[PDB]
Amino acid sequence: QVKLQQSGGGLVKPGASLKLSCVTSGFTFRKFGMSWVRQTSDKCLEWVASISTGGYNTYYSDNVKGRFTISRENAKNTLYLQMSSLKSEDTALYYCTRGYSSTSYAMDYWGQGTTVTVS
Amino acid sequence: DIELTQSPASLSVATGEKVTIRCMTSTDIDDDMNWYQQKPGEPPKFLISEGNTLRPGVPSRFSSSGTGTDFVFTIENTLSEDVGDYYCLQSFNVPLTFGCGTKLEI
C-alpha cells in the first residue's frame, strides 16, 4: 500500500542540473525520514542524502555535498533531490527511499528507480 | 565513514544448500546491520533490520547473527527463488555505508 512514485531523470551533459521527484502515499509522510540512494554501474549501492521529518536536518555523502540539495514539502508528500554541476561520476539509478522507523534511516520502502546519465 | 566489506564476492549453490555471506565493519555498529536482496531489475527488498530481526513476510529460511564488527547472513535451504544480490547496510552512523553485494547463484 506504501507507494513511492519517482520522476524526473534523463541524460544530461556535464555541468547540468536535474530535479528528481518522489511522491509518496500510504503513510503519514511527515512521520518518516526519507533518503536517496544510487546504484552505480557496478551494482554497488551508495547513499546520497537523508532528511529528517520536518526537513531541519539533512545529511549528504562527501561526494555530493554542496552540489546536491535534498528537500521535502510535507503538505504535498514529496521528496526532491536538486542536483547541480552534474559530473559523469553521478551516472547511476537513483532511488527514493523511506527510513523504517524514527531513529533510523535504514530503508524499508524503495522507489522504482530513476536513471540520470551524464554524458 | 565506516567501511563494510561484504564477502564472498559471488557464489553458486545447488538448491537446498546453506549459504553464508559475511559483512565485516571497520568499527562497532551497535548491531544496526541490515540486509537487503535485489532480484534482477527490482528495487532492493528489506530482509532483516537492526538487531538481527527478520522483517515481516520474509521467510524463515533467512537468518543473521553478528558481533559489533562481524555479521553473517544465512539462507538455510536455498530455494530457486533466492537468486539475486544480497547487500548489507550499517545504519549506525552517517554516511550510511553498504557492502557492494554478493551475487547468489551465478
Binding site: 531541519y56 536536518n57 527510513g99 524514527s102 534511516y105 | 551497535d30 545504519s91
Partner: peptide
C-alpha cells in the same frame, strides 16, 4: 542513531 536525527523532536 550515532548522531544523525530523523525525528525533529
Amino acid at each position: 542513531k550515532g548522531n544523525y536525527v530523523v525525528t525533529d523532536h
